Design a protein around this nucleic acid. Structure first.
Lengths: 77, 91, 252, 97, 135, 112
RNA sequence: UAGUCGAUCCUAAGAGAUGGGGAAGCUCCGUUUCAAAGGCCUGAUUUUAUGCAGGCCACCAUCGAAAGGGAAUCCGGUUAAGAUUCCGGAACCUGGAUAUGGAUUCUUCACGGUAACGUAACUGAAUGUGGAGACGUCGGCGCGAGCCCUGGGAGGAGUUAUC
RNA sequence: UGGCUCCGGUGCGCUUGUGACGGCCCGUGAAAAUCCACAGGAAGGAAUAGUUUUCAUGCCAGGUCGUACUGAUAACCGCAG
RNA sequence: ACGAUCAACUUAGAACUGGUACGGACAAGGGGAAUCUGACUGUCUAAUUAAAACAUAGCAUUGCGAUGGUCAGAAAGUGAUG
């Protein structure tokens, strides 16, 4: 239900010991009017709400996928 | 223009109800639906609702008064009587 | 043969009053130690319309002298009490329009209303709109006061009874004609079930003592004695005269 | 009487109208006289009677409401309180204030 | 004439400190670059000292007689000046325009104002300034 | 068009049973039962709605923090500012005026 | 197939106990009444189990509205017949527990804004007051929603003897 | 297994919700539960740390009864489809 | 005071034309001169009477100042108007 703009807040959430499931979604949307590009959404399941993180530039996204803790169960697409 | 010659507001009643009765209801609707001077704020904003009640539009006051006019003629003399009677207590 | 209408308004089934939108009773303040020795100041917050009452009320709020709280009391508003006026109940209260005083403390000619019969029944006489009693004399021996009621009946009461100064707001309410039937309907839908009044000549002899005939006529004389049986008293009751009244005003 | 004097001051002296302007001219001590209408609220009248005894400015009560005071100073609107800060030809500061 | 001198007591009538008695430590009748009007720097108290009585032990006197002060800029239309006064020469030069933003200097002012008002609460000259205006 | 039905089991058009028509993600029109509109808190003295207070139904106010129910004055969420201002001015000036009532009767009672 | 829909709870016009008063009696009146009409938080604890020493407060049964008042949800899918109830996902309310942060604090119970007021937090009992619940009907105006109408574009069907 | 599911416009339009108004009245047009706020100051609380669950997060639990279908020129009442 | 440009329909008039038709179906007032009667809007004999009857506003009368006037109860330390 919530949206998060910060990256380090999302990394604080992934280690909160209630978050058991996360998921990565890959959308295919178009920038300003011209071109298709690749959006990603990182959705972690807190026990009350479902927090998300919208990353448009994938050069942060590959670093962030690598930066997830490996104990977290990740649904990829 | 002046759309009616002699009925005025009681022209909403029409052909009904006689002539003397509509003249009599006219005499009191010209007082009732009028807009009176507020004695405190000095603004001509006193209107009525709820017969005997005269709420100022601004100023939040409410004067309990006569039913169709703000203070009827048999009442405004009474306070002058009080002005005669309260002076004898001191002098 | 049947029970007639005025015998039928007494069981109180559908002829009871219509009190939902009424604010409350319209009493004065319960006479306590502050009101029979000094005075006590209440501010008028909200003068309001009472449903079924020609006069407007006045919700004057007082300080409870024995516990810390505010007690709200519903006077009948005299004419010319703006909200935010301090109203002074008690014996030593001054004589201004809206103050409530004992009748032994005012001079004669004073135009008061909502006046008590016996001291402490909280506002019996002169309550309807436009009305007032006039103190026409004192009798300081055995503390009585002689007043004139709104009907023109002079009356001696006790000088510990309380009256609020000034005529009653809403005056001149019946100077306007009530032109249509629906307006009288909406008047009497908030008081009790006493409208429309069918004439008793227009009905049958089971329904009324005046009932029936091949012409609409009363029958015997329409003046019925004061001592008749409950059930005959339908007509004129104990009429000492009748007919169109003749004679000038200001009688002896 | 007093209204002819107010006309002479209003055409030959310096004044101010309103409530906020009289309070601003009265905190600065420029106010030499205040004239208060009859139908002003008593809270307002006490707040102007209190500022006057802080500044030692004399107060003249005006018989008649704010409509008659608006008519008196030559204006058309209503005015609750007038403050005279300079007198003209007349001497209303030193007559009976 | 002028009655907004630097020792007058005022009652704040607008804002978070409304109904709290202050003293005008530095008037500004003309105004400044910021606050484009006639403002003033006042120092007052946020919580009045409570009514201590004859029967309290001394330590329970202390947590009744505490004072929480405040310094503030306030417009002239947001003060009732009054005929009472308070001697301000203890902290006259402390609270100024320079005592403001970079707010760490405000607490250095609040300590001095608190000590001054507590030391004036002892030896109880100016009794009226320390009692809560009940409204 | 697509004609819609009530969702609950109350068929009458009361003040509790109101209807909004919403397009749902299946594409179809469907009704939505709408709660009655909340009203602003009012001043008890001047009747004007007083600002800074979230306008909610009366049991919603227990789900909310205290800063959506209050402003930071004395008489915060209860009375509007002007009235509070007036009941400072009056409540100052009378308690100055009363002191005048204590300074006159020290002299008139002494010069008698 | 229900924590979320309704009943449950509340009072309305009204019904109806108790105290009392009639009545030979069946029962009748009255509902806050000529009634000594009950519970609430802190202290006493380490005989004390939770009684007692007080400080308060006084209302004064109960019923009565699956169209009035009211704490809380939606979408998608699903069966031969159920779905706002089941299934997947996403929420919210009430009650109770306790921790982890953050905040406050030696100016012990926050600061900023002239102000209107704002900040994720930012003690507060008895008592009092205010607000919401809380509200006629008609008339036109403004805004919003859904439907309707329409343009370009991306698909599928129909017509084609002619267009 | 793939694609697309996009960009707009108008209104005395229809229905509906609402905001500020304006008319009406010898009609001025419910009550209680429930919840909140403020005034008040009892009481309690500092830092080698006591306070804070009307801040964020976490945990636990939500009982009973109704739920099918028609609501009508054949499912209700009118003796009956 | 313009230039570009864009959506609405409403109103008024002119020619031309039709086997003089055209609110082409549907929809959709007959009107006037008077008399008797009730003023009106309204209401009733549900299964023969919808009226000039009843009501009405208006006018007038009568009783009554509450230890009260009208009325209920078999009574009551009862009740309706209240």
């Amino acid at each position: 239900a919530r949206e998060i703009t910060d990256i380090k807040q999302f990394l604080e959430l992934t280690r909160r010991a209630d978050v058991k499931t996360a998921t990565v979604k890959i959308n295919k949307k178009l920038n300003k009017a011209g071109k298709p590009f690749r959006q990603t959404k990182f959705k972690v399941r807190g026990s009350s709400s479902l927090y998300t993180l919208v990353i448009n530039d994938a050069g942060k996204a590959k670093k962030l996928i690598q930066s997830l803790p490996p104990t977290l169960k990740v649904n990829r697409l | 223009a002046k759309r009616t010659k002699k009925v005025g507001i009681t022209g909403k009643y029409g052909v009904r109800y006689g002539s003397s009765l509509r003249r009599q209801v006219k005499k009191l609707e010209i007082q009732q639906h009028a807009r009176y001077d507020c004695s405190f704020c000095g603004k001509k904003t006193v209107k009525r609702g709820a017969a005997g009640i005269w709420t100022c539009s601004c100023c939040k006051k409410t004067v309990a008064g006569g039913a169709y006019t703000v203070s009827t003629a048999a009442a405004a003399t009474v306070r002058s009587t009080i002005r005669r009677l309260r002076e004898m207590v001191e002098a | 043969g049947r029970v007639i209408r005025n015998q039928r308004k007494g069981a109180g089934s559908i002829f009871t009053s219509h009190t939902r939108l009424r604010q409350g009773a319209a009493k004065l303040r319960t006479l306590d130690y502050a009101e029979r020795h000094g005075y006590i100041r209440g501010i008028v917050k909200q003068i309001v319309h009472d449903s079924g009452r020609g006069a407007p009320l006045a919700k004057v709020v007082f300080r409870d002298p024995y516990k810390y709280r505010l007690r709200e009391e519903i006077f009948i508003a005299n004419e010319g009490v703006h909200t935010g006026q301090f109203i002074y109940a008690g014996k030593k209260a001054s004589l201004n329009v809206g103050n409530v005083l004992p009748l032994g403390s005012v001079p004669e000619g004073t135009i008061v209303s909502n006046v008590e019969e016996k001291p402490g029944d909280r506002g019996a006489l002169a309550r309807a709109s436009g009305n007032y009693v006039i103190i026409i004399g004192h009798n300081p021996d055995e503390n009585k006061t002689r007043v004139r009621l709104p009907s023109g009946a002079k009356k001696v009461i006790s000088s510990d009874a309380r009256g609020v100064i000034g005529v009653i707001a809403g005056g001149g309410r019946v100077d306007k004609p009530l032109l249509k039937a629906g307006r009288a309907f909406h008047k009497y839908r908030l008081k009790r079930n006493s409208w429309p009044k069918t004439r008793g000549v227009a009905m049958n002899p089971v329904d009324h003592p005046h009932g029936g005939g091949n012409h609409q006529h009363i029958g015997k004389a329409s003046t019925i004695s004061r001592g008749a049986v409950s059930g005959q008293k339908a007509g004129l009751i104990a009429a000492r005269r009748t007919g169109l009244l003749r004679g000038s005003q200001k009688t002896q | 009487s007093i209204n002819q004097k107010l006309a002479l001051v209003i055409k030959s002296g310096k004044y101010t109208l309103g409530y906020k302007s009289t309070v601003k001219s009265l905190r600065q001590g420029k106010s030499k006289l205040i004239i208060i209408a009859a139908n002003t609220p008593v809270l307002r009248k006490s707040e102007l009677e209190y500022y006057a005894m802080l500044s030692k400015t004399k107060v003249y009560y005006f018989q008649g409401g704010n409509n008659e005071l608006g008519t008196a100073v030559g204006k058309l609107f209503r005015v609750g309180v007038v403050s005279i800060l300079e007198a003209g030809d007349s001497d209303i500061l030193t007559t009976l204030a | 004439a002028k009655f907004l001198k630097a020792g007058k007591v005022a009652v704040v009538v607008r804002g978070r400190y409304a109904g709290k008695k202050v003293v005008i430590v530095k008037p500004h009748d003309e105004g400044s670059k910021s606050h484009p009007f006639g403002h003033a720097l006042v120092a007052g108290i946020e919580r009045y000292p409570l009514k201590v009585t004859k029967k309290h032990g001394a330590k329970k006197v202390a947590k009744r007689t505490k004072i929480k002060p405040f310094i503030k800029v306030v417009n002239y239309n947001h003060l009732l000046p009054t005929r009472y006064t308070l001697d301000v020469e203890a902290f006259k030069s402390v609270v100024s325009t320079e005592t403001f933003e970079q707010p760490s200097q405000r607490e250095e002012a609040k300590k001095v104002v608190k000590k001054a008002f507590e030391e004036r609460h002892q030896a109880g000259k100016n009794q009226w300034f320390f009692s809560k205006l009940r409204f | 068009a697509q004609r819609v039905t009530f969702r609950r089991r109350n068929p009458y058009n009361t003040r509790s049973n109101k209807i909004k028509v919403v397009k749902t993600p299946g594409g179809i029109l469907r009704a939505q039962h709408v709660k009655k509109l909340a009203t602003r808190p009012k001043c008890g003295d001047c009747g004007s709605a007083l600002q800074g207070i979230s306008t909610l139904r009366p049991r919603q106010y227990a789900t909310v923090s205290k800063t959506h129910k209050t402003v930071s004055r004395a008489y915060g969420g209860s009375r509007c500012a002007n009235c509070v201002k007036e009941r400072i001015i009056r409540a100052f000036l009378i308690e100055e005026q009363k002191i005048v009532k204590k300074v006159v009767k020290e002299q008139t009672e002494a010069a008698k």
